[PDB]
């Protein structure tokens, strides 16, 4: 006989690009995510595909905040 | 050369573009510093051809500002850019 | 099946946009306001 499986999609290369304590310039992408695993904070923008990017020069920082416990990523100038 | 193992080659997976201008093959460009090769103070198509700074079959020429000249030249029938004309008048030449 | 259609400017500039339409659900023609860059003003575009 023959198997009816044997298919998979191409890789997408999702994940974090800039970690905490790193210096970034305006426009740098910080996180690539299929959903909102991380939420934008101060000086961080959100794209149509949920990508997070920097809107100002500074240093990246990660935190946990809010009632829901949402993880946030921000940039400190 | 150019064969890549069977996949469509670079020169055949890109579109052709542009058309060739006939008058461009007869148009000529002349640097201002080359006018020193001209014998005499008359700068024209005939004199440039004689000096061999312009090929014989060319039908028109243009002077552009590249270098520096130190003589007065009277230019007849040759197109001049603003800088080339300014340099000629500064050196003491005239146009027409 | 959706059919490809054009929207042509009413100003005579010849500018046109392209889109798709469902014929059975939209028997009639389409009119819509759009920007025309040749005259630099919002004008009506009609189906074609």
């Amino acid at each position: 006989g023959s198997t009816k499986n044997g298919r998979d999609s191409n890789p997408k290369m999702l994940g974090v690009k800039v970690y905490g304590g790193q210096t970034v310039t305006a426009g740098n992408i910080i996180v690539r995510q299929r959903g909102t695993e991380f939420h934008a904070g101060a000086n961080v923008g959100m794209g149509r595909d949920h990508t997070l990017f920097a809107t100002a020069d500074g240093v990246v920082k990660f935190e946990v905040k809010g009632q829901f416990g949402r993880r946030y990523v921000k940039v400190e100038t | 050369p150019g064969f890549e193992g069977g996949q469509t080659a670079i020169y055949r997976r890109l579109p052709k573009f542009g058309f060739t201008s006939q008058i461009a093959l007869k148009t000529a460009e002349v640097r201002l510093s080359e006018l020193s090769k001209v014998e005499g103070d008359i700068v024209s198509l005939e004199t440039l051809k004689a000096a061999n700074v312009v090929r014989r079959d060319q039908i028109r020429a243009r002077i552009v500002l590249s270098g520096e000249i130190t003589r007065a030249f009277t230019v007849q029938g040759v197109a001049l850019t603003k800088g080339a004309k300014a340099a000629i008048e500064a050196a003491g030449g005239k146009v027409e | 099946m959706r059919d490809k259609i054009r929207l042509v400017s009413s100003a005579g500039t010849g500018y046109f946009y392209t889109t798709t339409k469902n014929k059975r659900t939209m028997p009639e023609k389409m009119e819509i306001k759009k920007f025309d860059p040749k005259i630099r003003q919002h004008v009506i575009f009609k189906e074609a």
């Binding site: - | 050369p1 150019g2 670079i10 020169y11 055949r12 997976r13 890109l14 579109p15 052709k16 573009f17 542009g18 | 490809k4 392209t18 889109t19 798709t20």
Partner: protein, 63 residues
């Protein structure tokens, strides 16, 4: 004998000061579905990649 140019490549590549220039593919027929951004950005001319510069030189010796 004289080296001969590959005319197909000659019709696809023009010479610049420091390299070669070309247009982009995917702009011929299937265009309605494509987004405006792709149309705008993919319109124009781009430079040849260094990985292919050697091949282009071999194909077009006289430019």
């Amino acid at each position: 004998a004289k080296l001969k140019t590959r005319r197909g490549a000659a019709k696809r590549f023009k010479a610049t000061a420091n390299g070669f220039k070309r247009k982009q593919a995917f702009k011929r027929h299937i265009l309605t579905k494509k987004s405006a951004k792709r149309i705008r950005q993919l319109r124009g001319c781009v430079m040849v990649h260094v990985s292919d510069v050697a091949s282009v030189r071999r194909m077009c010796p006289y430019i």
